[PDB]
């Protein structure tokens, strides 16, 4: 054990002895990020790039115990350790941790070094001798030849809740991970007599759903447009997704919204394989120009379509569009790409090469509200294709999710949750129709209420 720490849920370190061996700069912050967003289903194991990590939660006194060991594989004693000392600590300081107020924690002191050292050396001595493999293997050969909440009590409702989430278009693996996270969140926690177990678990599950569906900061494209205009360089947005997700319609909606906000746009086309896509975008451009005359905005053009015909490579067309926008001083370029199946490797390689070459400011994955159990796989494939094809560390991944066709179900919204689980990035826009005015944002409370109203 090269690192160990015990601290409360309030973010206050209680006791640690890392010393010069390791520094708690951000090995526990990463674990906190994992436990808050994209909850860990690895059964109390985390793989930080520097070294592995193990955590244990105690909801009775809202405490956590983290142990960091090097990437080199250790023995099976560590988990046993994280149990026993836990009880020992719970035995040693009952009075301080049982109080709701945090003032007692600050007032109290913990001389826990000696007992923890004794436990660690006992565990190491036990791990020094391990020669029970032969007996276990021989036995396997013979066999082959031949108040507080308990997990078992809350299992039933759990699975029924899981079934409900399955009814709400949530992915099966996503539902299992969420149920495991909720179960970890409620282990031995005291429960009031007025409330019921089902009510408490439902409230905890809906709180977790609100938390996960409330992703990282809501940074908007509109504010970043002015920042891009500060250096007078075009702001590049790229749309990616599988076939049949309404990329063109959402592109038209976003262009119309930008024109209403008062910014010139340039629509770059790359749907060469798609029949009639160029003329579709041309019709959209004609409609937008009819709605917004150039002279009303000051005599300058607002929306222009950039294409090179069918069959041409998408990366070259995108680069030419970027250069043309820079020369003409267009505020924002929106790039439309043909839908690509996730299992088709060459298309993924081409898309990743285009993204790397054109280095767009924003990347938007256009998903489907109707799809279920497949959005997670598509997101995984897209993210891994974008990651492995970029040699630089911390590669450019998907930065925005656009959910369309939301006005066709209104009850099976759980699919969105799956996406918000598989990627921590927020949902920027939600499509709710086919007209140019059906481009709204996401309300977390309404989505959760509709998800769990039944």
């Amino acid at each position: 054990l090269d690192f160990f720490t015990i601290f409360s849920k309030g973010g206050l370190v209680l006791w640690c002895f890392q010393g010069v061996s390791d520094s708690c700069t951000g090995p526990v912050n990463a674990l906190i990020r994992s436990v808050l967003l994209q909850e860990r289903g690895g059964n109390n194991s985390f793989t930080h790039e520097a070294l592995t990590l193990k955590y244990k939660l105690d909801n009775q006194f809202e405490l956590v115990f983290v142990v960091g060991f090097q990437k080199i594989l250790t023995l099976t004693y560590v988990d046993k350790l994280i149990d026993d000392v836990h009880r020992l600590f719970r035995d040693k300081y009952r009075t301080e941790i049982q109080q709701q107020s945090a003032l007692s924690l600050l007032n109290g002191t913990f001389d826990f070094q000696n007992d923890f050292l004794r436990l660690l050396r006992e565990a190491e001595e036990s791990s020094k001798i391990r020669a029970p493999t032969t007996m276990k293997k021989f036995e396997d050969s013979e066999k082959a030849k031949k108040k507080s909440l308990s997990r078992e009590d809350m299992e039933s409702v759990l699975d029924k809740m899981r079934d409900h989430l399955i009814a709400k278009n949530v992915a099966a693996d996503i539902a299992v991970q969420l149920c495991e996270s909720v179960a970890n969140k409620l282990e031995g926690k005291v429960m009031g007599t007025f409330s019921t177990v089902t009510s408490t678990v439902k409230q905890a599950l809906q709180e977790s759903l609100v938390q996960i569906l409330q992703p990282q900061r809501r940074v908007d494209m509109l504010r970043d447009i002015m920042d891009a205009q500060r250096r007078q360089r075009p702001y590049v947005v790229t749309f990616c997704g599988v076939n049949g997700v309404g990329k063109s319609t959402n592109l038209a909606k976003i262009s119309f919204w930008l024109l209403e906000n008062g910014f010139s746009v340039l629509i770059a086309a790359c749907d060469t394989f798609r029949a009639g896509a160029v003329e579709q975008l041309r019709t959209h451009t004609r409609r937008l120009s009819a709605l917004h005359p150039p002279e009303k905005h000051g005599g300058r053009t607002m929306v222009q379509l950039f294409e090179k015909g069918y069959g041409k490579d998408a990366a070259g067309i995108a680069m030419e569009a970027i250069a043309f926008a820079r020369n003409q001083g267009f505020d924002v370029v929106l790039v439309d790409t043909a839908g690509r199946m996730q299992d088709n490797a060459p298309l993924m390689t081409a898309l990743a090469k285009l993204i790397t070459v054109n280095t767009p400011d924003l990347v938007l994955f256009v998903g489907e509200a109707l799809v279920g159990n497949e959005a997670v796989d598509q997101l995984v494939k897209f993210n891994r294709a974008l990651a492995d094809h970029s040699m630089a560390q911390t590669p450019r991944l998907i930065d925005g999710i656009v959910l369309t066709k939301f006005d066709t179900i209104d009850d099976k919204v759980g699919a969105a949750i799956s996406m918000t689980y598989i990627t921590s990035k927020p949902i920027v826009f939600v499509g709710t129709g086919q007209t140019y005015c059906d481009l709204r944002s996401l309300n977390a409370k309404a989505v959760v209420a509709a998800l769990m109203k039944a």
Binding site: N29, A102, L103, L106, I212, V219, R440, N443
Partner: protein, 201 residues
Amino acid sequence: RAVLLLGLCDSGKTLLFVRLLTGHYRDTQTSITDSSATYRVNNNRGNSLTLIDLPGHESLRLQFLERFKTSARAVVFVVDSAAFQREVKDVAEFLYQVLIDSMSLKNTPSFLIACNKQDIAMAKSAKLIQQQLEKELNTLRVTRSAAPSTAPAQLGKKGKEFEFSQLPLKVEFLECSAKGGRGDPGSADIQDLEKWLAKIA
């Protein structure tokens, strides 16, 4: 009643919370849940106020802010001066959200912006931070244009540069930093905070 501590992630809210209570340095991590503790004013009266610290992570700010807005009598906002340049948009957005939430209250709470990490040399001055906040909030109001897919409030009369003077709130600024070196061992810099707490008491 209760005084809320708000800020971004790793903004130092827990450090100030423990400093105002025990006066000793304690190692801290990122907040996961709230923490409420009763603190007496150093004055002769020694009145008690409930200091409540809320996690600064963006996945939990709004829930706790809307859940504890009613109980709060005074609101304290913490901004990292050293890391302000990279996170100006984030602090501006959070300030806009908290201002909108505060304006809904029947009783208007006192508002304080306390720059943190001031013990470092790269930290900016209070007036510079105030001017940057004014400049950013001038456009942040305009940037609010989207369909909520379900009651908007304006911080200015649509015609003038946004200023804290026109706001119906008492907004104060000060300089405070308690981490170590110059801060904790040498001489604590939280006396302005306790003076302001006594003034608002």
